[PDB]
Curated annotation (Swiss-Prot):
Originating species: Homo sapiens (Human)
Subunit composition and interactions: Can form homodimers and homotrimers. In addition to lower-order dimerization, also exhibits a higher-order multimerization and both low- and high-order multimerizations are essential for its restriction activity. Isoform Delta interacts with BTBD1 and BTBD2. Interacts with PSMC4, PSMC5, PSMD7 and HSPA8/HSC70. Interacts (via B30.2/SPRY domain) with HSPA1A/B. Interacts with PSMC2, MAP3K7/TAK1, TAB2 and TAB3. Interacts with SQSTM1. Interacts with TRIM6 and TRIM34. Interacts with ULK1 (phosphorylated form), GABARAP, GABARAPL1, GABARAPL2, MAP1LC3A, MAP1LC3C and BECN1.
Residue numbers of N-acetylalanine PTMs: 9
Name of this chain's protein: Tripartite motif-containing protein 5
Zinc finger regions, RING-type: 22-66
Subcellular location: Cytoplasm; Nucleus
Family: Belongs to the TRIM/RBCC family.
Modification comment: Degraded in a proteasome-independent fashion in the absence of viral infection but in a proteasome-dependent fashion following exposure to restriction sensitive virus. Autoubiquitinated in a RING finger- and UBE2D2-dependent manner. Monoubiquitinated by TRIM21. Deubiquitinated by Yersinia YopJ. Ubiquitination may not lead to proteasomal degradation.
Record's function text: Capsid-specific restriction factor that prevents infection from non-host-adapted retroviruses. Blocks viral replication early in the life cycle, after viral entry but before reverse transcription. In addition to acting as a capsid-specific restriction factor, also acts as a pattern recognition receptor that activates innate immune signaling in response to the retroviral capsid lattice.
């Protein structure tokens, strides 16, 4: 009458602090995206932000500098479908 093989919950990790932070959630930016302005953001925070400025004006833009560009068809610094094994 027993079942459940859960590995040790040692989520401890020894690494340096993070410098790249998200101007939205202000938490952390490990795999942020790149825009035509330079400022990075979360692949999610960006999607949500865009909607925000959709009911007021309609068009989205950098929530930091609000530069002129296309929030669609944007690619990050590096996009490779290669996962180390
Ligand atoms: Zn974020
Ligand atoms: Zn910007």
């Amino acid at each position: 009458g027993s079942s459940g093989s859960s590995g040790m919950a040692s989520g401890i990790l020894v690494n340096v602090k993070e410098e790249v932070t998200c101007p939205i959630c202000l938490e952390l930016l490990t795999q942020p995206l790149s825009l035509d302005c330079g400022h990075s953001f979360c692949q999610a925070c960006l999607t949500a932000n865009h909607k925000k400025s959709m009911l007021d004006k309609g068009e989205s833009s950098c929530p930091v500098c609000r530069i002129s560009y296309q929030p669609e068809n944007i690619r990050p610094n590096r996009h490779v479908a290669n996962i180390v094994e």
